[PDB]
User: Which sequence fits this backbone?
């Protein structure tokens, strides 16, 4: 009846070890010299993670396998084998890593079929809008190369996307409670951030977390107990008070 | 790199190529539109010129040889630039000559002043510290007579004071 | 009017060079793509042959 | 099976018109993104106005989407969808907000959603 | 070892800013080659201006390289490297030419070499 | 006959990429565009209905000699079908002459026949 989280650090190393053993045992090689049962091995390993029924005690086990690719080759044998098995994937990219966006999750490529059911009500309410905003921004991102001379409508979407990207940035070893993530994402998506310059967004977020720690504990406890957003006017008034207190650079 | 990285570059380059082709076609259409007026406006200019050249054997307040009539301050030149980009050096050269003539020569920074047409001209003169008086943010590409008329009357009127005696266009 | 028509002409003549440069880059990148993929395919053939011979 | 003798002349015409309008819209997206939409020819403005509504109307709510949405599905006969798309093409609904066409069944439900939003 | 708690906040910020600028300059190559240098925004023009100078400053003259070319080489402390890169990022030396930053030691030698070249 | 058709189609396929604009110059754009559109219209064909080589000759000659300039682009297929009916009704001399000599018939007679058909054709 307990809950377990399991992390496999490198299934590609595991598969390489198995390939070495198979080649030394003189079994026929498949593509990339890998043995034919390499997919069966990984599927048998991964399919032991499950959510047991109530008659079984209600326990669960969740797995986070890791796969390393060379030069972003996601179509290689082991990458495709592991991708076809798992419920979803998260793609991290070095180009996003160096441009300042860390953690380097690529939103366009990442998928999660269990998504929605795996979120709380308040988080879903704002993630629904965040998805559309990011999708529109990424669709229109190509035309930023033609300079600031663009249509009036598109520039608002570019600004919203830039602020969203700044908000999603995060530093090392600082997990953030969901009751604060929902508040900051609500502040972003409701337009409260549409006057703060892109350069000061991280400082805005940190000061907002401190302001929420000092005042507005009722919002945090309401979220933490009911798993839903508080009354709309109270949250807006709290954000307005913080915006009145906050000083821009 | 790999094929996975090369294909993305190829796709982006193809999209940019399609955008450039479409904008070239739009530019050609607007070129034909402009060339229509470039010949349609001829009769009015001929009508005005034939009469002023007829009656130009006398002395008047400004259209006589206006020799040293108010050089005192604010020598005014006109600059004509576009608003949209992608024109290459079209706006840049017009800005270059204006700068390298007046900003180079005139010692006191206010014995000259400029009025601009086009977004990029006023953007460059906000980069700089030039004394810009007024402009038009975005004219319609159509010939815009009886629309440009009020701008033109303002230009000649602020001349009539002698504010910018040496009026001399760059374009 | 002269300036407006000159603007249109300048944009038209710039887009020609833009498109030509883009297509030259397309040519170079496609050639590189194919000349790299041929190495992968011959490596696959070599690996298959060697694996068959090893038995 | 998308042939005149299998589905019918009217059905074939409606399908071809929808595909052609969508294809026409596909070529204008970059131009509309870069330059203001006013530079479009006045016919092309109607083309975009109708292509957006067709794209939104192609969406549908499912009975199995209950577990993800909390909203019941719908079942639309082909005899009704051809009529709905014919009406949208002829422009009998160009006076509604585009968001009324999303995730909806029959064409009457589009009007119902629009009036619920306050048209 | 490139962590804020190991090398310091100033060193970490300088390193990350340099890497970000170089990544942006690498990304800008396609548009630079296609549309030319003059069509980039006034921001990206400054980005290229800083990135070329930083890339040339990263080069160095070595003690053992004297057997190839007659330049004697120099040893540069971490404090001097961080100070020089901060100075470049602030835009202090935006007016100096590119070749002044090639194969030198401390940042003062860049100024000295610019004076020798005439600046 | 096919040389003019080949040249016209080749010229038109360049102007197909110019789908944004029409009448820039009548010689360079409008005439070539219209004739190529009519060529594409006549080169369409229905399923499982092959047509005789003599009738192909007659229709391609009609297109390439400019007798189809007045007929609008949208009605060209009905024009062609009704032309085949009119041929089957009143062109046995032309059909037999081409079918026997493998050469074009008398140009004046063929022009008279196509003029007679064009009188009876109705555009809508």
Assistant:
């Amino acid at each position: 009846g307990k809950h377990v989280l399991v992390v496999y650090d490198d299934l590609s190393k595991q598969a390489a070890a198995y390939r070495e053993l198979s080649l030394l045992l003189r079994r026929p090689p498949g593509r990339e010299a890998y043995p034919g049962d390499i997919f069966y091995l990984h599927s048998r390993l991964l399919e032991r993670a499950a959510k047991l029924s109530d008659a079984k005690g209600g326990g669960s086990l969740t797995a986070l396998p890791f796969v390393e690719t060379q030069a972003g080759d996601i179509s290689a044998y082991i990458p495709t084998n592991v991708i076809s098995i798992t419920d979803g994937q998260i793609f991290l990219q070095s180009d996003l890593f160096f441009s300042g966006v860390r953690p380097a999750i690529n939103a366009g490529l990442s998928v999660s079929r269990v998504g929605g059911a795996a979120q709380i009500k308040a988080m879903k309410k704002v993630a629904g809008t965040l998805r559309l905003d990011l999708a529109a921004y990424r669709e229109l991102e190509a035309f930023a190369q033609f300079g600031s001379d663009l249509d009036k409508a598109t520039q608002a979407k570019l600004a919203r996307g830039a602020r969203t990207v700044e908000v999603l940035k995060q530093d090392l070893h600082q997990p953030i409670p969901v009751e604060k993530q929902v508040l900051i994402i609500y502040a972003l998506t409701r337009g409260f951030l549409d006057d703060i310059p892109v350069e000061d967004v991280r400082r805005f977020e940190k000061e907002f977390y401190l302001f929420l720690d000092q005042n507005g504990q009722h919002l945090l406890e309401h979220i933490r107990t009911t798993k839903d957003l508080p009354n709309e006017d109270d949250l807006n008034k709290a954000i307005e008070a913080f915006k009145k207190t906050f000083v821009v650079s | 790199a790999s094929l996975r990285d090369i294909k993305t570059r190829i796709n982006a380059t193809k999209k940019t190529s399609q955008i450039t082709k479409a904008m070239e076609m739009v530019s050609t259409s607007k070129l034909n539109r402009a060339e229509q007026n470039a010949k349609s406006f001829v009769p009015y200019m001929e009508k005005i010129q034939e009469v002023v050249a007829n009656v130009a054997l006398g002395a008047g307040g400004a259209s006589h040889p206006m020799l040293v009539s108010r050089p005192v301050k604010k020598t005014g030149y006109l600059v004509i630039t576009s608003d949209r980009g992608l024109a290459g050096a079209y706006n840049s050269n017009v800005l270059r000559l204006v700068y390298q003539t007046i900003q180079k020569r005139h010692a006191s920074p206010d014995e000259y002043a400029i009025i601009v047409i086009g977004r990029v001209g006023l953007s460059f003169f906000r980069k700089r510290n030039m004394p810009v008086i007024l402009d038009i943010t975005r004219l319609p590409d159509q010939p815009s007579f009886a629309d440009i008329k009020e701008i033109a009357r303002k230009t000649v009127g602020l001349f009539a004071d002698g504010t910018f005696d040496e009026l001399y266009m760059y374009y | 009017l002269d300036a407006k028509a000159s603007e249109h002409a300048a944009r038209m003549t710039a887009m020609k060079n833009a498109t030509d440069n883009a297509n030259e880059l397309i040519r170079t990148l496609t050639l590189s793509y194919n000349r790299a993929r041929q190495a992968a395919i011959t490596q696959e053939i070599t690996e298959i042959v060697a694996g068959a011979n090893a038995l | 099976a998308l042939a005149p003798e299998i589905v019918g002349e009217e059905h074939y015409q409606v399908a071809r018109k929808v595909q052609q309008t969508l294809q026409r819209y596909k070529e204008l997206q970059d131009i509309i993104a870069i330059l203001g939409m006013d530079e479009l020819s006045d016919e092309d403005k109607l083309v975009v106005h109708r292509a957006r509504r067709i794209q939104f109307f192609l969406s549908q709510n499912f009975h199995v989407a209950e577990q993800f949405t909390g909203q019941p599905g719908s079942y639309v006969p082909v005899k009704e969808t051809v009529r709905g798309f014919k009406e949208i093409l002829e422009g009998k609904y160009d006076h509604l907000p585009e968001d009324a066409f999303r995730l909806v069944g029959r064409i009457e439900e589009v009007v119902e959603k629009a009036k619920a939003m306050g048209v």
Remarks:
- Chain A touches chain E at residues 95, 98-100, 145-148, 172 (CB under 8 Å).
- Residues 125 and 229 of chain A are 8 Å apart (CA to CA).
- The first strand of chain A starts at residue 3 and ends at 8.
- The two ends of chain A are 52 Å apart (CA to CA).
